[PDB]
Design a protein around this ligand. Sequence first.
Ligand SMILES: CC(C)C[C@H]1[C@H](C(=O)Nc2ccc(-c3ncccn3)c(Br)n2)C1(C)C
Ligand SMILES: CC(C)C[C@H]1[C@H](C(=O)Nc2ccc(-c3ncccn3)c(Br)n2)C1(C)C
Lengths: 475, 475
Amino acid sequence: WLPSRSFIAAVIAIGGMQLLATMDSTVAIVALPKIQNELSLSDAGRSWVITAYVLTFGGLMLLGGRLGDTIGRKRTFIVGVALFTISSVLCAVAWDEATLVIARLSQGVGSAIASPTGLALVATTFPKGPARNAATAVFAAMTAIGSVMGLVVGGALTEVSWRWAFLVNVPIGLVMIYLARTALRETNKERMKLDATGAILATLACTAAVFAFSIGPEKGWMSGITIGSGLVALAAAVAFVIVERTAENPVVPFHLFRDRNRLVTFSAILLAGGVMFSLTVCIGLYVQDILGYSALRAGVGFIPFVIAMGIGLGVSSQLVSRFSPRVLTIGGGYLLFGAMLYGSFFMHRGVPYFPNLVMPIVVGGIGIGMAVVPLTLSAIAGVGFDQIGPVSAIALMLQSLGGPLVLAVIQAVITSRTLYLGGTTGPVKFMNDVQLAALDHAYTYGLLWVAGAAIIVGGMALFIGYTPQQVAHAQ
Amino acid sequence: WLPSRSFIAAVIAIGGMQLLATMDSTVAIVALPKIQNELSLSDAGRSWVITAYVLTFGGLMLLGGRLGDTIGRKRTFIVGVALFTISSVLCAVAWDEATLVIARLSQGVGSAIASPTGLALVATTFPKGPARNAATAVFAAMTAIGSVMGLVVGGALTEVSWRWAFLVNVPIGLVMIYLARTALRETNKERMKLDATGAILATLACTAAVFAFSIGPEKGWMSGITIGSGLVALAAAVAFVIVERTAENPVVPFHLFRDRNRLVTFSAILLAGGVMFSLTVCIGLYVQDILGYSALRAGVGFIPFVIAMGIGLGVSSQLVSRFSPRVLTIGGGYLLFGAMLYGSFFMHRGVPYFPNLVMPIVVGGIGIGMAVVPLTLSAIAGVGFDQIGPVSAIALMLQSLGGPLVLAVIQAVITSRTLYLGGTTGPVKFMNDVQLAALDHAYTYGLLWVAGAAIIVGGMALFIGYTPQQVAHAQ
Ligand SMILES: CC(C)C[C@H]1[C@H](C(=O)Nc2ccc(-c3ncccn3)c(Br)n2)C1(C)C
Ligand SMILES: CC(C)C[C@H]1[C@H](C(=O)Nc2ccc(-c3ncccn3)c(Br)n2)C1(C)C
């Protein structure tokens, strides 16, 4: 009850990077159409606005994870958050496509440098035990807070110009840099050297893969650029693996994958993050399009999701010290699966808010809050303080990567269903009631597919062999 | 509230055959070891005692289903229940192996004649609507009552000789024959002729298959007798299909399998009955062996399962008129899956009764009661009064057949796990604590496998395309 001010300031400062990044991404998604109208942007720019940020977020994140070790996690976290804030400032004063794309690239650089270092700071500054559980709970809770409050900000500031939308990154960034300065404690001066070749190879492979995946649907899936970027990514990845095989300071430790339970945990993290991201996108689109709710209305409706995830994460953090991560993950998935089944069976257009919408979202949020803590706790387990960087970077990369990878499948299933039912393809303004009902049924079918994916997730999580002793009991 | 006396008497009389058959089977399983000691029986006879009954129950049941149409469902039900009662009387005075085997064969004949006719009487005397829902609820509820009360009777009468155990079949049989005589109403005299060749071919195929499966584990799996019986069963089945292709009065209507939703429903019935039977066997063995509970204690502990299934079946019968059978089946399976997960995660040797044993069983019973009614309602749907016999017979055959077929897999998994953990094979008296713990863990693993099977069941049940209009809304 009422912990130390230093502890709460430290956890807030550490989770601040995920909070800020998710909130900024949500605001960008919400305010994307306004940028196109005001700046007179084409669909290519509509892609590029998010493409640059995701490109530099996925490309340099392993570089950031190792750079945290080579310079110091606190100091590189400060650098990353400051760079993100400055890039947001530059974006807020953008006047053409080039400067905004450069600002998005700089934001991606800042996020890639800072967020894996954020996970490493969760796992490093606080020793194993109740402190780590509380840090993880705050991490996930304020990530959800950032997402939903960014949706709220985007909905509220849609009347004013989009320039003001990106400025909320500034006060939050400054205050959380101040919190990291004053609160977080610096360790000894065990300066450690970085291996340039492995880092640059990993960066090249990741950036080529992200560029290929982003340019796929726009430029064509078998065009020259997409296949060239894909083959470049594959060659860079295989060269990176070959170099890491003999690296004295591995960028990614292939040594630490000896434990098969760790491989199971990482794959479960990937697929669970994918399911969660697909759920986010599908719920946002379904609420904003079918039910006709504004973005501000969507945010104030998802605030109960934030509350429910708060209770779920608190309960999971309390219960990890007694129950196995397998058990808690399965229970959270059970609650989330019940919520998804209820959503896919008893909700169509015109349903009320309190009966049919608050309860499934609250139950799903409680389940997700129960499931997140054990998974990421098992991710950061059995590692030295000199090995935490790459492990956290890989876990965060899997969590962020699984999202779009299965979201593409879910979108394909939904569009196939809505064309099977006879729904018109395009913006929801043109379609009349019949195509709207077809889209609603397609969204329910996509939710059923997401539920099947969650079934798979639990199937893999049933093999998580860790015991709570080596997770949340310190010495 | 307080329906007509004729209606309640009719539903009790119709479900009486399943009640009596299940109760007698449970009593026979409980009292099997006492028969071996008193009569000086070998392991071959230990097999034969149940083998004869299951042989004649699975062999002649389709013959009974069509014989219900060719003579009259009420009158053949009377004949079947009377034959079962007389066979139980003859078994109660058995003095050697031959007469007891003959009595078991006669009991199997009676069950095969009467129980599919029982399902046909559920689906025929009461027209579609609330009456059919109530009849189905009573059917399933008193089937569970028969099973659990037979376990109670076997546990209570284990001190006295096994002769008295089989005599409870007599008063119940007589009173339910009286109920069927006085209450159930006979239809017109639309006497209809039976096709002998198809019926005899189906009987031969079924009896050969049951004999092969029963003689498999005892005599060897690749012995001459088992492979010969298997090939005879296959030849009889293919000849039966060829004859049914051109049968003027098909024993099994291949015409009615046009609807793919019906095929999905029948396969779901098969696998759900298999899961339920495996659950019954595993729970009985785990309670009687690991926890060291007597059969009477097991029955008084499973009485709450009867209560919970009663509430579940009542709620499902009420809700079928509003929700689709798919929805109710999925919800009942969700509750049952939660119960199985809780049982497989937080129960080992030495757990108390009220906290760790009553609640999972009650939740599973409520889920099963919710799931049974829609499935069997979808089974008896879209059929004429001249086609109900074979459909009910096929549904009951699938429900009874799925049980041992997946129970063998579950037993193999459990024994493999307990030998992997180092547990000794054999009766639980010889093994010490370490093998007992290994057996407990193996039982939990088998429960996990049953949970996976239930996941499969829900996967198939998600394709059940019926709407409640054509299930429980009469005209
Ligand atoms: C056989 C089986 C055990 C299936 C299993 C299904 C399930 O839901 N698994 C599951 C667990 C956790 C998560 C999750 N992880 C991180 C964040 C949010 N949620 C997710 Br998406 N799915 C069931 C039925 C419980
Ligand atoms: C994807 C999926 C929808 C999986 C589904 C699992 C399930 O449990 N399906 C299910 C339904 C009914 C029955 C049943 N039928 C008759 C009598 C008793 N029970 C059984 Br065994 N299993 C879940 C998670 C709900």
